[PDB]
Amino acid sequence: GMQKLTILGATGSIGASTLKVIEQNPDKFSVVALAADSNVEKMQQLCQRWQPEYAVMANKEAALRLKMALAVLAPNTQVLGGQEALCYVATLEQVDSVMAAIVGAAGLVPTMAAVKAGKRILLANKEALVMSGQLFIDEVEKSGAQLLPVDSEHNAIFQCLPQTVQGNLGRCDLASQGVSHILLTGSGGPFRYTDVAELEAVTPEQAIAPKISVDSATMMNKGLEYIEAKWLFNASRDQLKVIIHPQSVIHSMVQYLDGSVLAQMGEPDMATPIALTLSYPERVKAGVKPLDFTQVGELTFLQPDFERYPCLALAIEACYLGQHATTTLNAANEVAVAAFLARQIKFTDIARVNDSVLNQVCKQLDSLESLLELDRMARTLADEVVRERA
Amino acid sequence: GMQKLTILGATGSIGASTLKVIEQNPDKFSVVALAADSNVEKMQQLCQRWQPEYAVMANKEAALRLKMALAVLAPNTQVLGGQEALCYVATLEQVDSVMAAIVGAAGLVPTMAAVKAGKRILLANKEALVMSGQLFIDEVEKSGAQLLPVDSEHNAIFQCLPQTVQGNLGRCDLASQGVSHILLTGSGGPFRYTDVAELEAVTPEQAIAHPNWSMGPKISVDSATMMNKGLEYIEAKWLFNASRDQLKVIIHPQSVIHSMVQYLDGSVLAQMGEPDMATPIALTLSYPERVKAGVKPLDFTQVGELTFLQPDFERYPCLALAIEACYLGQHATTTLNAANEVAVAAFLARQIKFTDIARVNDSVLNQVCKQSLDSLESLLELDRMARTLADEVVRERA
């Protein structure tokens, strides 16, 4: 039958890619609610095109402006505002799936509301597993919600795993389904061939080839992905390897016990992984062409050097320590990057800030509230370490 | 519980790879019968190690020599000889799976006997589908036998396909499980970068060199002409029920990727691994589970660069013939396969040039299908007729 969707985070690239898949499959997917942060203009255009039952701005002042516009552009769309309203559209009885694409800590509560209601969760918020991995997996178990990862690397891993593990994410023992290890691939960022010595002098201009760009450059992006993969797939440290693949044609791979490797490849378009999150276990047209082997060029592989990418080592370390450490590390890194971009600290100080803060905190029963509180503490400590370094 | 095996073709590399996997999993697999053609020395050593209930030599004279060697060294091994005995061990009530690794046309009857008995078939004979695809698929359907492909390409495709297709091979509509197409992958052979003009003069030595897998002379030459990929195309049609829109061919020179499947959402699944036949075998034995195969995980720090090319039909005319033969049906694929056996043997005998292989294949195929209810017997007969014609065309070329 028709699958009914709420899209949390409708005005960014993920939202757009989701809508493109839905546009290719009007017989299968129906948009009940669209929700966003504060890009009212884009949201007006989308409510006009999609005429959803509900439209929600996270910001109440932004909601008011949208309401005025939709009196005219989408008169049958009920406009709402605030966090409560995000939870309300994420938990509607008629809704089957929730694209959880509101980014940052503000995404936690609405995503979790969808989990507690037993929805299918198309997970495109990093914070849910980076900050609150154990909570999320427990609440998913308790409600019977289905979790499907949107992000490219996770989605590729998901596709490369057997059906038995796919249907029971975060609870299968991987060794028992024949998995030796997961190969999380990444481009290595723009400093992949740069001599370690030259990293000290790197500028924000160079690092950007904004926040997510700097994370690419440090491989903190991959670290956070590693942490998420641990929770999504219940992988131990022996089961999770990071491989640099500079061309990003392969999006990730799984090594099996018999020697077999499965890899997922394709054109660089988020509609591909999204489309599977919506259609699983079936497949649908995504508006993405088949891979052109005439243009992929050479594929190569490198082992990450932890001297080049110290943030990657920290994230791996933090992962073994648990939720408190991953929350701490994620928070500290937001502050550290903001400081680098503000010119206050060198590129290589990002890891130093992260490393001090992490060491300070972990030298000493969780909720989303207590973890947000730790996130704030960690930020305060990072502000102080940033000061020591200027 | 314990899976019971008959191995047809125990003394070659496939047999050895199968026995390596079994040796890693004594709690899961047990060998009921071993069968071979005339390598008594190797069979004696294997019967001594495995002490199977039955040992069969295809050649009755060889069976007699084995029987004498085994009286004491393997006293509980009943030794048998001939074709009837191959069918008997392939159809035993206690046997669950049959590694069908007897190569050539001689493999047809025993492999078919296992099919008709409803066994799990670990298919490692090309001829079953190249010569008699339609027959095999129909008999598999009737008996409830399971076909699991051993060959590297097919096994990779199998792994890149969804569980629903995997459990119902040759019966599923591929479009309906989201498949756009299968990408059949080949190395391109040692002449992949060679100018077409220089192909005329190439030698057997050149044709056999720098291989990514261990292969005998014939299969190596087929790799050089891309006849290998053509035959595999024909098999893939029967095995996956793939239409003319669903089967493509691509060159991947390093043979790290073994095959790939393109899906409707843009997603491509690829199977990769060390060039060790224990990997695909192991899955044919363990499916839907997995087992240790004695093969190391792939080391991505040593695979080097992966690249892709497109086959040029001027460099690979056999590939065009195979595709054409596939559209024409069983008679044409049987004819082509037979003609190519003769043509390659002639090239290796230094009677014809490398580029005469396609010319011989092309004449023979044209002659037969210009001039117009199948059985294994009638298809063997066509194979012999096509061989006679190929012998004649080889003579014209020397």
Side-chain angles (χ1 to χ4, degrees), chain A residues 1-210 212-319 321-390, chain B:
Chain A
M2 195 88 85
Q3 206 189 123
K4 282 159 195 182
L5 296 173
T6 286
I7 306 179
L8 308 176
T11 58
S13 62
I14 295 294
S17 287
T18 307
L19 291 164
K20 166 162 84 163
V21 176
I22 291 162
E23 193 168 27
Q24 291 286 303
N25 298 276
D27 46 321
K28 289 164 190 303
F29 303 117
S30 165
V31 178
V32 164
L34 298 175
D37 179 2
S38 43
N39 185 355
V40 171
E41 184 143 63
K42 184 66 184 178
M43 191 64 155
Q44 284 168 209
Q45 280 162 198
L46 300 178
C47 291
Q48 170 144 62
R49 167 48 187 106
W50 294 94
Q51 300 288 316
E53 285 169 65
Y54 298 98
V56 186
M57 301 304 285
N59 181 263
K60 288 207 165 80
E61 284 73 36
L64 257 66
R65 295 209 289 114
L66 186 68
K67 187 177 282 191
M68 293 180 334
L70 298 194
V72 175
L73 303 180
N76 292 327
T77 294
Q78 166 79 256
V79 173
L80 302 165
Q83 193 172 243
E84 282 287 295
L86 292 176
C87 294
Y88 175 80
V89 298
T91 58
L92 287 162
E93 208 186 350
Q94 73 261 40
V95 167
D96 299 298
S97 312
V98 180
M99 171 50 78
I102 292 165
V103 295
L108 290 186
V109 168
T111 308
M112 179 59 79
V115 169
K116 293 178 172 169
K119 304 302 171 184
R120 196 162 156 115
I121 310 293
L122 321 180
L123 183 66
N125 171 279
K126 306 195 91 61
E127 284 73 26
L129 299 182
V130 171
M131 301 178 70
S132 49
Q134 184 69 257
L135 287 200
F136 268 89
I137 298 317
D138 289 343
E139 291 290 346
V140 171
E141 172 68 8
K142 161 172 169 182
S143 69
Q146 305 164 7
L147 209 70
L148 296 118
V150 165
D151 233 64
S152 173
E153 298 81 4
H154 302 131
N155 186 272
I157 293 156
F158 181 88
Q159 289 188 56
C160 290
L161 290 165
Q163 180 187 24
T164 58
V165 179
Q166 291 179 340
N168 203 7
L169 279 185
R171 279 142 307 175
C172 287
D173 177 78
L174 286 180
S176 77
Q177 307 310 296
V179 174
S180 303
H181 57 252
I182 289 162
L183 306 156
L184 176 47
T185 50
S187 82
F191 313 124
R192 63 174 75 88
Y193 311 122
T194 308
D195 284 349
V196 171
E198 303 184 2
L199 297 178
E200 174 166 23
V202 162
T203 62
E205 282 83 56
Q206 291 179 278
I208 279 162
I212 304 304
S213 302
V214 174
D215 283 348
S216 283
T218 63
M219 281 194 85
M220 190 53 177
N221 76 327
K222 210 57 43 178
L224 295 180
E225 292 172 17
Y226 179 108
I227 290 152
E228 290 182 275
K230 177 257 189 259
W231 292 109
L232 275 168
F233 307 117
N234 189 44
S236 66
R237 195 189 198 120
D238 297 294
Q239 298 169 329
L240 203 43
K241 308 217 180 297
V242 177
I243 298 291
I244 284 165
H245 168 46
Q247 308 79 14
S248 293
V249 181
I250 294 168
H251 298 135
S252 270
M253 312 179 273
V254 177
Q255 174 74 74
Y256 288 86
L257 184 73
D258 52 7
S260 185
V261 176
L262 289 183
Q264 193 269 349
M265 301 163 73
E267 298 289 343
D269 189 331
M270 289 305 294
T272 291
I274 291 159
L276 186 66
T277 73
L278 289 155
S279 63
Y280 184 91
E282 303 185 281
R283 304 235 186 204
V284 298
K285 294 191 310 303
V288 176
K289 283 169 195 207
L291 183 53
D292 177 15
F293 288 94
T294 293
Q295 302 301 139
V296 311
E298 63 170 12
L299 311 187
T300 65
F301 308 84
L302 264 52
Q303 194 147 310
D305 189 342
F306 290 163
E307 276 191 18
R308 175 169 295 101
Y309 304 110
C311 291
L312 181 60
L314 294 165
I316 296 169
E317 190 202 331
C319 185
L321 298 168
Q323 260 171 186
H324 290 200
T326 58
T327 299
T328 296
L329 177 63
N330 178 251
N333 177 71
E334 293 205 341
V335 169
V337 172
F340 167 70
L341 291 176
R343 210 82 255 213
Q344 299 169 2
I345 65 171
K346 293 182 178 178
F347 180 71
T348 54
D349 293 330
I350 291 165
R352 294 191 196 96
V353 166
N354 288 340
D355 185 37
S356 307
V357 173
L358 184 59
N359 274 49
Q360 283 191 82
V361 178
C362 277
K363 208 196 312 195
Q364 288 72 280
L365 181 60
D366 296 331
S367 59
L368 294 167
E369 189 201 328
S370 83
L371 291 161
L372 291 164
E373 185 56 28
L374 182 64
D375 172 287
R376 195 198 48 74
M377 290 193 179
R379 286 162 185 283
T380 303
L381 277 176
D383 291 328
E384 191 49 30
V385 180
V386 165
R387 208 212 22 84
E388 286 160 27
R389 209 70 68 158
Chain B
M2 197 87 86
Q3 205 187 125
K4 282 158 196 183
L5 296 173
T6 289
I7 307 179
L8 308 177
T11 57
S13 60
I14 295 293
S17 287
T18 308
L19 291 164
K20 166 163 85 163
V21 175
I22 293 161
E23 192 166 29
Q24 292 286 304
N25 298 277
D27 49 320
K28 290 163 190 303
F29 304 116
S30 78
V31 174
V32 164
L34 299 175
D37 181 1
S38 81
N39 189 352
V40 177
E41 185 149 65
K42 189 75 181 188
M43 262 306 251
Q44 143 169 351
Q45 182 212 285
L46 301 178
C47 291
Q48 173 162 9
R49 168 50 186 103
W50 294 93
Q51 300 286 318
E53 285 178 73
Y54 297 96
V56 184
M57 304 303 283
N59 180 284
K60 287 207 165 80
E61 276 176 343
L64 293 173
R65 299 193 305 274
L66 186 66
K67 185 161 152 42
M68 294 294 294
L70 298 194
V72 176
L73 295 181
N76 296 307
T77 297
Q78 161 144 64
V79 175
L80 301 167
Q83 195 180 60
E84 292 305 324
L86 293 175
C87 293
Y88 176 79
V89 297
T91 58
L92 289 163
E93 257 291 85
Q94 73 261 39
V95 168
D96 299 297
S97 313
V98 179
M99 170 50 78
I102 292 167
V103 293
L108 292 189
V109 172
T111 311
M112 181 57 78
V115 169
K116 292 178 172 168
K119 306 301 172 185
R120 196 166 205 273
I121 310 293
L122 296 44
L123 184 65
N125 172 277
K126 308 197 91 60
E127 285 74 25
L129 302 182
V130 168
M131 302 177 71
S132 49
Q134 181 70 255
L135 288 202
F136 270 89
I137 298 318
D138 291 342
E139 289 292 343
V140 170
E141 173 68 5
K142 296 171 172 182
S143 70
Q146 273 197 293
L147 216 61
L148 293 119
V150 167
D151 181 69
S152 173
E153 188 78 26
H154 302 131
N155 186 274
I157 292 158
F158 181 88
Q159 292 191 53
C160 290
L161 289 165
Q163 182 113 24
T164 60
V165 179
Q166 290 178 341
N168 215 330
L169 279 185
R171 295 274 307 173
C172 285
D173 179 76
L174 286 181
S176 74
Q177 308 309 299
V179 177
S180 304
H181 57 253
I182 289 162
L183 286 304
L184 298 152
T185 304
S187 81
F191 315 119
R192 63 176 73 88
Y193 312 122
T194 308
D195 284 349
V196 170
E198 302 184 2
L199 295 179
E200 174 164 20
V202 309
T203 62
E205 283 83 12
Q206 290 175 302
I208 289 167
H210 302 308
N212 295 311
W213 293 80
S214 278
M215 298 170 290
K218 200 271 172 179
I219 303 305
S220 301
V221 172
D222 280 352
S223 175
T225 62
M226 281 193 85
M227 192 52 94
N228 73 327
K229 216 55 42 177
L231 294 179
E232 290 177 1
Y233 178 112
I234 289 154
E235 289 181 275
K237 180 256 189 258
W238 293 112
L239 201 56
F240 303 114
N241 189 43
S243 69
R244 217 171 295 85
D245 295 293
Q246 299 166 333
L247 279 180
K248 317 299 177 155
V249 180
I250 191 168
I251 288 167
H252 168 48
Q254 309 80 11
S255 294
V256 181
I257 293 168
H258 297 138
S259 186
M260 312 179 271
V261 177
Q262 175 75 72
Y263 285 95
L264 182 73
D265 55 6
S267 183
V268 173
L269 287 186
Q271 193 267 349
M272 300 163 71
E274 294 286 329
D276 188 330
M277 290 305 294
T279 291
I281 290 161
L283 186 66
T284 74
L285 292 154
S286 65
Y287 186 86
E289 303 218 297
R290 304 236 185 204
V291 299
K292 294 192 310 303
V295 173
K296 41 167 194 205
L298 186 59
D299 177 13
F300 287 91
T301 64
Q302 302 292 298
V303 308
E305 64 170 11
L306 310 188
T307 63
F308 304 91
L309 267 51
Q310 298 187 320
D312 184 342
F313 288 127
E314 276 190 19
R315 176 168 296 102
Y316 308 110
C318 293
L319 180 58
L321 297 165
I323 294 170
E324 193 188 335
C326 182
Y327 157 70
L328 299 166
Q330 258 171 187
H331 290 200
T333 59
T334 300
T335 295
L336 176 63
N337 180 64
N340 178 71
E341 294 272 1
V342 169
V344 173
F347 167 69
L348 293 176
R350 289 160 221 281
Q351 298 181 332
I352 64 172
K353 292 178 179 178
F354 178 71
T355 53
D356 292 328
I357 290 165
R359 293 193 195 95
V360 167
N361 290 339
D362 185 33
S363 307
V364 174
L365 183 59
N366 285 283
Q367 282 190 85
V368 177
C369 279
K370 207 196 312 196
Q371 298 177 322
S372 283
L373 210 156
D374 296 333
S375 60
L376 294 167
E377 190 198 329
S378 81
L379 293 160
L380 292 165
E381 180 43 43
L382 182 64
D383 173 288
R384 196 193 40 70
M385 176 178 71
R387 286 163 180 281
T388 304
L389 278 176
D391 293 328
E392 180 183 14
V393 180
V394 165
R395 209 173 293 122
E396 287 161 27
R397 286 286 171 180

